[PDB]
């Protein structure tokens, strides 16, 4: 039970800091060229929904 609790605690801590680092890196992952590409893709999706009337 001690080994199970130790491994589960380490797994939970690893998951928590991985999630926080992923959030921070995603907030650091935005580039203006990719922002323009995502805006163009959103406009294309909105136009595709406009076709589906």
């Amino acid at each position: 039970d001690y080994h199970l609790e130790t491994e589960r605690a380490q797994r939970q801590i690893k998951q928590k800091n991985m999630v926080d680092w992923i959030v921070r890196n995603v907030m650091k992952s935005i580039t203006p060229e990719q922002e323009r590409l995502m805006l163009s893709k959103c406009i294309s999706d909105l136009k595709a929904m406009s076709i589906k009337a």
């Binding site: 797994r11 690893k14 998951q15 991985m18 929904m49 589906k52």
Partner: protein
């Protein structure tokens, strides 16, 4: 390991933002959201808010829709976007929910992962009619000696557990759940029973202890725990009995048998009273809305015994009512008594004296009766009921003749015989043998303080070198006078062997 789970959660989280006829929250407060928009929405239709909450479209007014929120109202602000789901309020059902603790909406709260449900059923479903119903004839074995003898429960029956706080209502219900392990582990699929426990308004620690107790006794494998605790919103506490009833109605309509317990319906009625008072509805008796009888009646009418042309299924309900100072003359207890087929009243006075379970025999009756019992149990319980009636007739005035003292001693020995410990239910053969020994005068020389020790040692003796007696009882299904004489002889031999 973890990265694969992250990839599966990311791939399964597809937004799919298309069409999506929506509305705007005009105002949020008192658990009711007014939504401007949603022209083509249906009545009682489930919606989703922008914060991830869900709701039910209650009122279809012209200029707005009144939506009952299944959650806290601090997560919803003015001007939020409400999306319709296109479905009347439904919960997942199936055998995937066995072994799981879910909330009122069916979302798992035990951390075991997603439920792989294949079907969903609505919570507002009408009850079966006269033709798809047949008489209740199969026994529901709770494992309690007093219930299985005096107030029998059949499959499809609605039996009320009513009493004051801290009197053992939840203990009786959990023992009924635990007792079905012998049927579920056996091979007879007709006698297997699937349990649903609906915790409404209780503390979260209490529900955690109940789940641990069911896990230790391995009764969790056939049990679904629907939890709506005291910290949850009132609409969740109102919805949870109907969600559990839909989960039991799955087994009812598929030829299986389900037992459902609502612990307790008085807290659900308090939550519904809060919802109605926040909706400015007119209060009635004890400031309750006038459809609280309809609330419990539409919940409990779905527990019934189906016919053979409908699969032969059944749903058994055990509602729980908490009274104040033992008053069964209140509004909600009188409603549930008029709805159900019988009650099991628990006394505070008997509970303070150590009589556990504290079942009041004079007040707890069952309208089904002989159709809900086996032959041997009915044969010995009729004599037990007559002897306890004679004891209650002679002990009311005697507060003497040799016959009166004999009846008093017999009633005292039967009362000490019906006492049972918590979390240890008994098989029907052990209860039949125990009541047979008590009724037939085999305990006349035994002190009332040693009845429990005699009961344990006699059970050990029967299971040790009297297996042929149990085989004969199971084969005959009753107690013949020849086997009665053999049982009297071996009881006399056992009591002479124990002390001489």
């Amino acid at each position: 390991e973890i990265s694969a789970v992250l990839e599966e959660k990311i791939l399964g989280a597809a937004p799919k933002e298309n069409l999506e006829e929506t509305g705007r929250v005009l105002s949020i407060g008192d658990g009711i959201a007014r939504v401007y928009g949603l022209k083509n929405i249906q009545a009682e239709e489930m919606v989703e808010f922008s914060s991830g909450l869900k709701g039910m479209a209650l009122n279809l007014e012209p200029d707005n829709v009144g939506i009952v929120v299944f959650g806290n109202d601090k997560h919803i602000k003015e001007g939020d976007i409400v999306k319709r789901t296109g479905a009347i309020v439904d919960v997942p059902v199936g055998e995937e929910l066995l072994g799981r603790v879910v909330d009122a909406l069916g979302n798992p709260i035990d951390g075991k992962g997603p439920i792989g449900s294949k079907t969903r059923q609505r919570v507002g479903v009408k009850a079966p009619g006269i033709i798809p119903r047949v008489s209740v004839r199969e026994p529901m074995q709770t494992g309690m000696k007093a219930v299985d003898s005096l107030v029998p429960i059949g499959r499809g029956q609605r039996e009320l557990i009513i009493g004051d706080r801290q009197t053992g209502k939840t203990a009786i219900a959990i023992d009924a759940i635990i007792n079905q392990k012998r049927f579920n582990d056996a091979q007879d699929e007709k006698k297997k029973l699937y349990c649903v426990y609906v915790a409404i308004g209780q503390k979260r620690s209490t529900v955690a202890q109940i789940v641990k107790r069911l896990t230790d006794t391995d009764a969790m494998r056939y049990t679904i725990v629907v939890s709506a605790t005291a910290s949850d919103a009132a609409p969740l506490q109102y919805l949870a009995p109907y969600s559990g009833c839909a989960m039991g109605e799955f087994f009812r309509d598929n030829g299986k048998h389900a037992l459902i317990i609502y612990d307790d319906l008085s807290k659900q009625a308090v939550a519904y009273r809060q919802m109605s008072l926040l909706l400015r509805r007119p209060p009635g008796r004890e400031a309750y809305p006038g459809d609280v009888f309809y609330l419990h009646s539409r919940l409990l009418e779905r527990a019934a015994k189906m016919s053979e042309s409908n699969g032969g299924g059944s749903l058994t309900a055990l509602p729980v009512i908490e009274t104040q100072a033992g008053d069964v003359s209140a509004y909600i207890p009188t409603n549930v008594i008029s709805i159900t087929d019988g009650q099991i009243f628990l006394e505070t006075e008997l509970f303070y004296k150590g009589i556990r379970p504290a079942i009041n025999v004079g007040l707890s009756v069952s309208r089904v009766g002989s159709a809900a019992q086996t032959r041997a149990m009915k044969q010995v319980a009729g004599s037990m009921k007559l002897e306890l009636a004679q004891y209650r007739e002679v002990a009311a005035f005697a507060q003497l003749d040799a016959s009166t003292q004999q009846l008093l001693s017999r009633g005292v020995r039967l009362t000490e015989l019906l006492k049972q410990g918590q979390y240890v239910p008994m098989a029907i053969e052990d209860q039949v043998a125990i009541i047979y020994c008590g009724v037939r005068g085999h305990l006349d020389k035994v002190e009332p303080s040693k009845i429990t020790k005699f009961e344990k040692e006699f059970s050990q003796h029967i299971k040790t070198s009297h297996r042929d007696i149990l085989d004969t009882i199971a084969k005959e299904g009753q107690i013949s006078p020849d086997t009665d004489a053999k049982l009297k002889k071996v009881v006399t031999d056992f009591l002479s062997t124990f002390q001489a």
